[PDB]
Amino acid sequence: SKLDTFIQHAVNAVPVSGTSLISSLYGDSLSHRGGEIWLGSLAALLEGLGFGERFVRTALFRLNKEGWLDVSRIGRRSFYSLSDKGLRLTRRAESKIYRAEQPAWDGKWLLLLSEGLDKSTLADVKKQLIWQGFGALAPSLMASPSQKLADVQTLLHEAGVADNVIAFEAQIPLALSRAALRARVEEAWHLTEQNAMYETFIQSFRPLVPLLKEAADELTPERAFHIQLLLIHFYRRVVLKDPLLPEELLPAHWAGHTARQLAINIYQRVAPAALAFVSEKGETSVGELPAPGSLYFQRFGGLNI
Amino acid sequence: SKLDTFIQHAVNAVPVSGTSLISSLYGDSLSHRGGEIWLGSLAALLEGLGFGERFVRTALFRLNKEGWLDVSRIGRRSFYSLSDKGLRLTRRAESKIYRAEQPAWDGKWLLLLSEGLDKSTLADVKKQLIWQGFGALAPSLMASPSQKLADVQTLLHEAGVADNVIAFEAQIPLALSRAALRARVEEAWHLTEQNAMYETFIQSFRPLVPLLKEAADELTPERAFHIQLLLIHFYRRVVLKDPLLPEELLPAHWAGHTARQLAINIYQRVAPAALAFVSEKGETSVGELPAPGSLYFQRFGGLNI
């Protein structure tokens, strides 16, 4: 069938990190269901995509070593759960991925000038801020229209640059001609790269919509779960790299909304059967997984189940 | 008399530019008295300083070629007058030199970013902004705590880059980041160099305070004028390079305040007799120099004449 052909091609299109895929699985399918599952369940969930047990074991071991998953050996079974760090990262990504969306923008920026320390600690703190969503408006000026001082105070202090950084709360009183600024942000945040990523995503998953409509009845729980996992995994790859700047600052043909709409359209079609597969396969030390909590159904502004 | 010795030492310490000296004389002594004088008057006004006719004539010729002075041959006399441009530039310089006080600060900043430009447009617009009072707070980043955007828009579009300039109105919210700011400001405006210039000026002219007290009656109009001209010439040399930053951004060991009061204390003492000397020697195309207008008497917050 064409659904399997789509699934197999999607899984083989790019090298897939086991740690990354299993993170996607936890974030999407398990975080509203207790965050814990048997290694054996994960193997059964990924077997039909061609991932064998040793691949799953190695990914889980690495995710524990990175501090993302805790593990409990109970009886003769190993159970892996989101660690405290994994929980905070998962909740953080949840806001960006499942998304209603932007609060309205107050027009205020935070600008950071990092000088009075020579430029080797500088690059360290530069990227630390970049990973937080800041763009390099200049080789010493970091900027974000979304973050505020509260979100970087802690980072600055035990980077050891707390009062070696000048912070500005700035506003721009011009709205007739942004052309030069908007260009600045586009290259500062590599928005052309980001749009291309959104746009590879759209081309990759657009054929799934007619396929799901054609094979609605042949969509088994396992195939629904594999589609959902691959969809959200590759969507999460693009969206988490998105600085999520206000619309006013984006290029005129931002594919991100189309990518989002497509993700939601596929997600709603496969989620009911996919939940059933996780329910069928998932086990903890006390048996069946919990039902998804209410936050699960609030994803994407509301799931029509 | 030690006054004559002071005058001779001051004028012979360093080469004196004729164009710069004559600009000082016009700006200080003639801009409120019709802006015009006979070449012969200038020669008589500067003779006692050791400057001869060729020095004066050559300087006037250059000031005309630069567009600072117009020249008239009327009868058999040459008259040099502030050009329309020269008058405008003199008034601008006067606001800084005779300023009645450092402006009060609201704490607000203006930040300017460029791009889509060359060498020539970059260094060019950087050129005007620097003399306009802006500092390169960071590479590619110009800043001023005092100016407008409105005060630079005529300048910016006249350069043809208004489409490539990003403007920010900025603020610093908590006084904990201020040490770093004062350090950055020091290098952006080279305040250590500026302060050293002020200290040289103070060291050169502080001895006049006791001398003028001692020889108060022995001060003739010519010597009062030569003192005033040398004082204002060397003071404007330093102060016109001063960005005149708010008090908050300068050290507690800032010599600019000492320099200004010293200039004022000497200026108030010699200005009446120096004015008498200029009236005695000055001749215009319509005869005598006019009396100084009221703006003259508002200098330094008010002249005690």
UniProtKB/TrEMBL annotation, chains A, B:
Pfam short name (any one): PaaX_M
Domain Transcriptional repressor PaaX-like N-terminal: from-to ranges:
18-86
* Domain Transcriptional repressor PaaX-like C-terminal: from-to ranges: 189-279
Supply the InterPro entries for this chain: PaaX-like_central, PaaX-like_N, PaaX_C, PaaX_trns_reg, WH-like_DNA-bd_sf
Q: Which residues form the Transcriptional repressor PaaX-like central Cas2-like domain?
A: 103-172
Q: Name one GO molecular function term.
A: DNA binding
The protein's UniProt keywords, in alphabetical order, are: DNA-binding
Q: Does the keyword Cell wall biogenesis/degradation apply?
A: no
Q: Which GO terms describe its biological process?
A: DNA-templated transcription
The domain of life for this entry's organism is Bacteria
Q: Does the keyword DNA-binding apply?
A: yes
Query: NCBIfam families per the record?
Result: PaaX_trns_reg
* Descriptive protein name: DNA-binding transcriptional repressor of phenylacetic acid degradation, aryl-CoA responsive
> What organism does the UniProt record list as the source?
Escherichia coli
